[PDB]
Amino acid sequence: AKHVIGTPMKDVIHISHGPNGCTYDTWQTKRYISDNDNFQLKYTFATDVKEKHVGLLKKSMHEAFDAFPNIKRMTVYQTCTTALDVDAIAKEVMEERGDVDVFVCHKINIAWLNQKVGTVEPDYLGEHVINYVGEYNIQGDQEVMIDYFNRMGIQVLSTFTGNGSYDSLRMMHRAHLNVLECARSAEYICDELRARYGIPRLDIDGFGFEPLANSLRKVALFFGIEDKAEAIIAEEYAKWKPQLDWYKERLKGKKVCLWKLWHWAHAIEEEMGLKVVKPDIIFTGKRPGEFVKKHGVPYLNAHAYHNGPYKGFEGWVRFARDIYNAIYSPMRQLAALDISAPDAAITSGFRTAKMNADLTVSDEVKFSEVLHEYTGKYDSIAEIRARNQAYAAEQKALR
Amino acid sequence: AKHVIGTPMKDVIHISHGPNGCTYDTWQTKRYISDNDNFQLKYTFATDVKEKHVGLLKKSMHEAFDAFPNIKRMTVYQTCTTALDVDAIAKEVMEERGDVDVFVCHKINIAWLNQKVGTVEPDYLGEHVINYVGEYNIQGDQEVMIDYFNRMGIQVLSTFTGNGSYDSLRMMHRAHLNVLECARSAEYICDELRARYGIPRLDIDGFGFEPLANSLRKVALFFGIEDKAEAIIAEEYAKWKPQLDWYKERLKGKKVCLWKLWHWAHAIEEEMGLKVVKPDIIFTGKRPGEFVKKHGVPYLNAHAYHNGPYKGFEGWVRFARDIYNAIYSPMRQLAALDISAPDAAITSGFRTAKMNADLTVSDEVKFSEVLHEYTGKYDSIAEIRARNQAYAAEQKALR
Amino acid sequence: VTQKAREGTINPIFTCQPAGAQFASIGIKDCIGIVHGGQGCVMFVRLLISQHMKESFEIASSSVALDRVETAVEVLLTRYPDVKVVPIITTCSTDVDGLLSKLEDELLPTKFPGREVHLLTVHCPSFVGSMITGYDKAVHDFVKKFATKDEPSDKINLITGWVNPGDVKELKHLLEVMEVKANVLFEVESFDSPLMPDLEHHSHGSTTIEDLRDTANAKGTIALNRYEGMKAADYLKKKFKVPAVIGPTPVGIRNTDAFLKAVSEMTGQPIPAQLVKERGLALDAIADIGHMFLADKRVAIYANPDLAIGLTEFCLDLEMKPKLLLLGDDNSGYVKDPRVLALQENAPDLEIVTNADFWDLESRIQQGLELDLILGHSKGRFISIDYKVPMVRVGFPTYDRAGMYRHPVLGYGGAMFLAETMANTLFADMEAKKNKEWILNVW
Amino acid sequence: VTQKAREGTINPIFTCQPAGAQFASIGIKDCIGIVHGGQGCVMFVRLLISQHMKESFEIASSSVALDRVETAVEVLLTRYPDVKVVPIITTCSTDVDGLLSKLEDELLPTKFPGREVHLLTVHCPSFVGSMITGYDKAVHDFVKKFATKDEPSDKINLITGWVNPGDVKELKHLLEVMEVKANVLFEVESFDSPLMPDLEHHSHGSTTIEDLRDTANAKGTIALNRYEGMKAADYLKKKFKVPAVIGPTPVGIRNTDAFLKAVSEMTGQPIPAQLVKERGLALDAIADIGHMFLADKRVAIYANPDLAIGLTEFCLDLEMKPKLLLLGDDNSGYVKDPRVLALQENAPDLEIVTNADFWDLESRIQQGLELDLILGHSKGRFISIDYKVPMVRVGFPTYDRAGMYRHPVLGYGGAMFLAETMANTLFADMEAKKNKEWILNVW
């Protein structure tokens, strides 16, 4: 809850009523980024309960507000130690400051809906309004999908919760549709939003070219704007398909071990040619990845990505390039070589990943003037984020 | 010539008609800085004479102008190899470009005066105009003295040559007075300026508190503005004398070996308490300094300074602090200790230079509430340079 | 000395004691510790160690429960036929000693006949001290569990404290030149494991049960860190009469000299001329940069307490100006520390904050504290990034620079590495800000 | 391959041949070379070596002139009673061989009876070639002067090329692990001298006259650099039938493997498992950063030619994208180099500029070449400073970073140091520009 769902909120002080060690362990371990200068990644607040405490919470709440005068939203989490009256303390703090709001936190969904949803009203409501639910903005995924929605002329009322604001998530109850990215984290939010306000839910997939195109087409079909989705799909296909197919030709038949397992498995086999099952690559977390590194198998981080975002068409191409770079590394073949063998295949000079990968393709593929390698900057979110902030400015002037 | 006098010119392409190895050897070895982004320190131009040449000069002259379109001034130096018609080539280059001027290089003084001096005419001439001659702006010395002159209401027509421009040095014949910083390098310039235009000469000293104050007083006496010099001297004394005396109390009786020998020697003994003569510090160049480093003796660079500028009252305090830091380093006493000796004076913890220096002073000095350590930024020229560029802007508006 | 006047924490500098206990345990050969708490605690501690070293280490969990401990021990011993030391570490929500007594009589003799298995407890409450206290109590608990009187030995005990593999490599080089054999606690050089062609090799600790047993028979104990190993040294002195020397942490030239003098006094071994030449090499490198670039540089330092204090002392010897020293836990021994008293006496411009968090540094910078350099670990990286103060990565964890664990901060090689790294960080900052960057030619 | 289309030079990458001759000479024990030119030539070469190493070296001058050379030799032998090798180096404006013949019969036998003094000439015109060719011709001249046939030896000749003391330390470590004795040309580890308590120790070279004499009796010669030592190896092969292996420069894992294979073939010594373990440590460090940060990084490289080519090959192995390779002199052997041919064949986006200056890089950046990293020495630092491209300091001279001479760029330790240094330079740039700097947590 605190470590996955609550934290991606960008303009909130998340203070844990408990010891420092729990607040420390989850700090700077995630990649939920935001356009609020990553405030949710840079600062972490604990009440610092000591043995004597087993007054303090009220004072720590005031201290955090004082240190960060531009933050007016607070979420107080109760840890294991403090289970042995936070609500009243929060009311007193709100009364004394007078311009701040405090939230006392599956469970985080019930808590937010029964406490915060419905208390704020949007000033402007577009023709087509959605709630993006279950997205937590790993390396810029939320901003990728917002760009896709903006180019469709769709206003995203709120994202739950990645790069999301407190007030938007309180305004969540006035959307025309809910689009659900992750269900295992935010099913109840959508079910109860439908139960209380009759807001339809549309499950979508943001990974791949066909799953994402179909998701965009369903979203457009709901709003009767199918032509905009078709134009987006055609443009993104023309831009990124030759680059993706360049890697798909060199990744046909490679094996991946998965330790984002069904959001990925079918699209990986269909669009990258990989066989999901010694594997050629393992998709896992950082510590298991470092474990399997000792076995000569590369890994891509399945939780935080490597060179993300992996969402969108360009993100899919970045994912393919990451796979291809890990699999076809010349250092991989150098590490598997035993130089102490009496007849060891010791060479000099260099090799490239392209040299290794082109041994697997045919001459027609190898000399294609259509397929080319990925042509994108190291940070692909800077241009998407600048586009997103320009659409917000343009939409604000029209209003 | 090409290495000491000509190069400090900030807006000139100094192209050497000769091999690359001579141009390389003196590049990035000096600390003549300028407000033209150190163009004279960043770029060096050679004709690159090869064995075949033992046409190319014209092409390399054109190439340099092409690569640096904002530079319209060139100085061509003949090296040893090219002794075995630069003037004609320079004329044809000027004719073809049409908006550039080329200068064909004790010797460089005669060459500049007999060709370039007297051509350009000053746009504005103030009440009090000087030529600052013999200053080459090591670590910002010229900017220090310009600040002192600006606060006196004196316009510096040109500096020869440190942080000096080509056109200003061509305007050298319309100054009311010439002030001499170095004579061994620029005696002839001012002798012949007096011979041709009757411009009086005033030898000055920029180092120390008494020599610099007397220099300022002489300059003011020439222009009848003695009160401005007195105000400058009083303000700078009140600001920097307690800080200088803090170091002078801790440097009384220390010995310095000189390997800037007479522009320094008397003011060092008088104002810092040092005895110029194992020495406690050696003033020398970088390579001899590294030689004597092996003997347990610190050095301050006598040519390029250490933490310069050493000119001005604040520069004198910076010089004193550099001396005191080198002499009283705890590392100096740690390095002289032989830890393999049976009864070695091995300690733990720390020492400071202040702890070592305070063992030499009396209790009245040690607990003075007047003397304090130097209070100045690492780069002291940034504020002086900003003041200089503000006075130039203000003088533009009035004109 | 400043004590934090805020009750809450913003951006803690240390984690909880169980994490320090687990880090102490992973330095022992054939030791896999079971943490009697949530699986998330072990997951985050393993992630933190993986962040520091980029290596996976084996730590087990009980998934809370006295009987769950029994099942966890059974499962661990079944699934790891090489583990010999099985420490049980308690946590927030958590009589494991009597349960272990029953286990060694019922489960081990029956299910694992002939298998050498040692069970011990490390009680680590998470709201009393910090990971420093946890490491100290874990080292004490291991030494207490294993130390046994035997035939006298010519070795000394070197309790290094919570240090990097590069620090251990440097310390062992110094001991080898001095011709001194030691029971090094702990041998963490094997944390850096190779990427082998055929046979996989995983990260592990190299301290054996024999070393911990033989700690009782040493000539003496040198505990480099007063807060990370003084408890074990005091236990050894109190029970087996092993004389103990506490500190100094050999950060810099002078403290390394004092460390070598302590070794020479313990062992009777003279300081040789090779150490004189290595110390001289470090001093020559330091003389190249000292009064040209290091003097008068304003420094903020936070690290493990002993390392932070030693770094402050080394910076003061280098003619730098330490402005802020952050000690990130509530230890009451800091005020009576003679090194801290000396810092108060002869470095009056240095503020020492105990029980500090990163907000102490960040708010002091906000209110106008001008700094040229920071010495600290990677959890404070965003202060450096956002306020444009260069930082040299020291301590645990340093996850935003590559391979910092392989370099020493102790010894003469550590002094040289520290001084040159501080100089190079300053040089890169001078170039980034174009602050007299032309001066890096003829120094 | 690009050849510079400008006749003039802007910002040369190398100095003249006499400087390279003097640098080769200062690596010999009891050698003080007299430069038959201006005082300023020797002053600037000594200043350049002092910039690189921060150490003073003894090089003599004749000040200009055969009688001047004779007087200079007399004065040098009077004022230095330890010098044995006295090479005379010619320069721009300069029968030193005939005079030297006369001197060895008239001056040395009479004025210095019983003193072992060797006089040789190194002719180094400054309008042909560069400091690389000057170093090559100086090494050839020393080997030619001293090599003498004797009883056969089990040693090999390792002509390292113009390398750093850290490179020599790494190469000697590799040879010692492989159990190979060598005549190392040159032993420059003593360039780094200590700051001793009482006695003064000055920087010098450790290559003796005995090593240069014994080069004729070796099993074989391995010249790491084709442009900095192939002439001496070819002379040895042509005169004394000493088999010569030219290259590869052991930059990176693969080239170090090829170097160790060449050593094993020359000597018959097997490659041991310790080198396997050290290579694996380097490979594990490289695997931590390779496809996360190093892949697809756009790199410009300039250095000494062999080092620059090897760095390009290592970067290509690391999945980086070398864009520009600058070879700063007019050598005609670059086009026929099989390494350069391989770079043309399989690195298609790499432009190789021969006879280049720093304006090649700077103008290519001006016209739109986007780079993430530069590998080059300190004379090109202002391109990095002004165009905001991070640079890793490699080669000669590196005077704007502290102690770069003490780290290897050769061997597996050199490969690890290079990869981690490029990673850390990129990390510091990412933090300075705030370019995905949050990503440096859980890599």
Numbering used by the authors:
A (entry chain C), B (entry chain A): 54 to 107, 113 to 142, 146 to 166, 181 to 334, 339 to 356, 398 to 519
C (entry chain D), D (entry chain B): 5 to 68, 77 to 106, 112 to 460
Paper passage:
Nitrogenases catalyze a key step in the global nitrogen cycle by reducing molecular nitrogen (dinitrogen, N2) to ammonia (NH3). Some diazotrophs encode ‘back-up’ or alternative nitrogenase genes: vnfHDGK for the vanadium (V) nitrogenase or anfHDGK for the iron (Fe) nitrogenase, expressed upon the depletion of Mo. Upon complex formation, low-potential electrons are transferred from the [Fe4S4] cluster of the reductase component via an [Fe8S7] relay (P-cluster) to the active site cofactor of the catalytic component. The active site cofactor is expected to follow the general composition of [MFe7S9C-(R)-homocitrate], where M is Mo, V or Fe, depending on the nitrogenase isoform.
To examine if the αIII domain flexibility is observed or even amplified in the resting state of the catalytic component, we tried to solve the cryo-EM structure of Anf(DGK)2. Using identical conditions as for the AlF3-trapped complex, particle orientation had a strong bias for top views on AnfD. To circumvent the preferred orientation problem, we collected another data set of the catalytic component with CHAPSO detergent added right before plunge freezing of the grids. The use of detergent mitigated the preferred orientation problem, and we obtained a cryo-EM map with a global resolution of 2.49 Å. However, the map is missing electron density for AnfG, suggesting that it was solubilized from the complex after the addition of CHAPSO. In support of this hypothesis, loss of AnfG after the addition of detergent leads to a destabilization of the αIII domain accompanied by the loss of the FeFeco. Thus, the G subunit might stabilize the active site cofactor through interaction with the αIII domain.
